[PDB]
Design a binder for this molecule. Structure first.
Ligand SMILES: *[C@@H]1O[C@H](CO)[C@@H](O)[C@H](O)[C@H]1NC(C)=O
Ligand SMILES: *[C@@H]1O[C@H](CO)[C@@H](O)[C@H](O)[C@H]1NC(C)=O
Ligand SMILES: *[C@@H]1O[C@H](CO)[C@@H](O)[C@H](O)[C@H]1NC(C)=O
Ligand SMILES: *[C@@H]1O[C@H](CO)[C@@H](O)[C@H](O)[C@H]1NC(C)=O
Ligand SMILES: *[C@@H]1O[C@H](CO)[C@@H](O)[C@H](O)[C@H]1NC(C)=O
Ligand SMILES: *[C@@H]1O[C@H](CO)[C@@H](O)[C@H](O)[C@H]1NC(C)=O
Lengths: 175, 167, 148, 50
């Protein structure tokens, strides 16, 4: 006798679910062809080994991703018609887009967001990324090995920063 | 799970009955609600065809009455295909269904686009030579339809009694 | 009363979804149309040239005009060049070669040129940079004096 | 029915705070990642490299 109340709720919730799927699709699927890095790592002297995926692992998730996933019932609420649908993209596919964007960024620069990937030596790329913030290209080459140490060391601390306290991921853990 | 000598039946964090102690024999049983789910229908256009594939969500195929067990649930009426293509009618946990070989409803693991590899080297630059101009297009809604609704005419059918009760 | 209250609330939420699309359109109508935008993948998909608004029932439609490259040719390169100890760098462009000679071009359109002092700037000496390659750098100011 | 209607409404609102973060992450992944930015204090604190 209470009319069509349930239908409104179900429509709203289904809209939310479809919206969540579209959210993940829009955030991650910015790339059309899945690239992947060459077998050799002559990246001018930069140790990308923490962020690139590691084969010696069940999933293809890289080190930092593994740390984050470790950093962060089902039937308890489920007794009363509260089902929870599964996400469309699996947590492995998401880790596949990411390993593409990393691969394309390192080897192609930014020209893979416009057309197709264009090969460029990494050491020559950052020379163009400086040249867009004022300092001439000569600063990079003349001090290439110095910057490599600072950059490599920089990733050193962030790994320990996450693995020190659990208050780093406050934003997701609230959700 | 073993209770205390006097404690009879347990609860959860959300105070729902979970276990129980049998009266005649002091044995411990667990209660689990018998299954439910949402029946769903995957179909292409009615104009294109009239074959549909039914999807039970979170129900084991054994208790449901071509089958297939996907993480989403049980899917009957569709055929698994090893080959992977772009998604047509998304289902759940990386499975897409479409209508192509007559034709039948095929379910498959979705393909994350094509695959490509690039030849990075110490000394290799690719410099494009020719260019093309394109024209994209996108649409943004701006304004929905202005409307207005007076209460007293909606709730009350223009009668003195209703108008003086709503006051 | 409950039936009417639910309908009003939904509208307020929906009318706040549109308000965030009449502000993302009133922005694209500003950078995209009345100027050239360098915000990657904001106006179109690729390097952006201009835009053309059009109307529609309760909305707006754009026609972004975009520039994308077509054919890629592999080439050999070197991040510097040494002539007389002094390294030489491209003022704006890459250093490219086709096996016999070297050339300097633009970033996004193959157009070789002769490596003269008119478009390179020296810096330091050529025993510090890595990947530098020996070559000659032509001098434009010599021949006219030799002509006289 | 009141309690069920309250949970739905809270979701509808709270599920619009996320939609204002997905449309913000989807931006940063298009300037910061696929390119270099000049929006000060958008992609990090300082002049942005990659
Ligand atoms: C109930 O009676 C049965 C049969 O005599 C016996 O085996 C069982 O132990 C009794 N249980 C209780 C609660 O006395
Ligand atoms: C039905 O499908 C056919 C083939 O795609 C098409 O030519 C025809 O116009 C469609 N008619 C409908 C459903 O409007
Ligand atoms: C389905 O039921 C059978 C028999 O109880 C069981 O062996 C199987 O593991 C169940 N599968 C799932 C998906 O739970
Ligand atoms: C097709 O997929 C199924 C399920 O993963 C697998 O058992 C089978 O070996 C596959 N067959 C082929 C031809 O790859
Ligand atoms: C070029 O890279 C290869 C690995 O791809 C390496 O073996 C070789 O030594 C490098 N040569 C130079 C110029 O450093
Ligand atoms: C560039 O060289 C690589 C490796 O030989 C090759 O795979 C690729 O097709 C070449 N590209 C062009 C268009 O010359």
């Amino acid at each position: 006798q209470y009319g069509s109340f349930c239908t409104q709720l179900n429509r709203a919730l289904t809209g939310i679910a479809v919206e969540q799927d579209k959210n993940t699709q829009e955030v991650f699927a910015q790339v059309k062809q899945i690239y992947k890095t060459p077998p050799i790592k002559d990246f001018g002297g930069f140790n990308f080994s923490q962020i690139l995926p590691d084969p010696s692992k069940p999933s293809k998730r890289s080190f930092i991703e593994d740390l984050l996933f470790n950093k962060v019932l089902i039937c308890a609420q489920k007794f009363n018609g509260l089902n929870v649908l599964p996400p469309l993209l699996t947590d492995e596919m998401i880790a596949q887009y990411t390993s593409a964007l990393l691969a394309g960024t390192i080897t192609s620069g930014w020209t893979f967001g416009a057309g197709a990937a264009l090969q460029i030596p990494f050491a020559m790329q950052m020379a163009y990324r400086f040249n867009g913030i004022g300092v001439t290209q000569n600063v990079l080459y003349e001090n290439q090995k110095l910057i490599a140490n600072q950059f490599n060391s920089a990733i050193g601390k962030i790994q320990d920063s996450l693995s020190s306290t659990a208050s780093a991921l406050g934003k997701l853990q609230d959700v | 799970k073993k209770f205390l000598p006097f404690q009879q039946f347990g609860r959860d964090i959300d105070d729902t009955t979970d276990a129980v102690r049998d009266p005649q024999t002091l044995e411990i049983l667990d209660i689990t609600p018998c299954s439910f789910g949402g029946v769903s229908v995957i179909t292409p256009g009615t104009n294109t065809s009239n074959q549909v594939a039914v999807l039970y969500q979170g129900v084991n195929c054994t208790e449901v009455p071509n089958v297939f067990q996907t993480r989403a649930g049980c899917l009957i009426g569709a055929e698994h295909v090893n080959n992977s293509y772009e998604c047509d009618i998304p289902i759940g946990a990386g499975i897409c269904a479409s209508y192509q070989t007559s034709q039948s409803i095929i379910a498959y693991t979705m393909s994350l686009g094509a695959e490509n590899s690039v030849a990075y080297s110490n000394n290799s630059i690719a410099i494009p030579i020719n260019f093309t101009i394109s024209v994209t297009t996108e649409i943004l809604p701006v304004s929905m339809t202005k409307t207005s609704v007076d209460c007293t005419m909606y709730i009350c059918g223009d009668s003195t009694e209703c108008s003086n009760l709503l006051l | 009363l409950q039936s009417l209250q639910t309908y009003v609330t939904q509208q307020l939420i929906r009318a706040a979804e549109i308000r965030a699309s009449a502000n993302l359109a009133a922005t694209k109508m500003s950078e995209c149309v009345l100027g050239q935008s360098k915000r990657v993948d904001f106006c179109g998909k690729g390097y952006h040239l201009m835009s053309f608004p059009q109307s529609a029932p309760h909305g707006v439609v754009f026609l972004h005009v975009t520039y994308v490259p077509a054919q890629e040719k592999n080439f050999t390169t070197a991040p510097a060049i040494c002539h007389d100890g002094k390294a030489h760098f491209p003022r704006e462009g890459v250093f490219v070669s086709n096996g016999t000679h070297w050339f300097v071009t633009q970033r996004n359109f193959y157009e070789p040129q002769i490596i003269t002092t008119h478009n390179t700037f020296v810096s330091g000496n050529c025993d510090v940079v890595i990947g530098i390659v020996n070559n000659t750098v032509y001098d434009p100011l010599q021949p006219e004096l030799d002509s006289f």
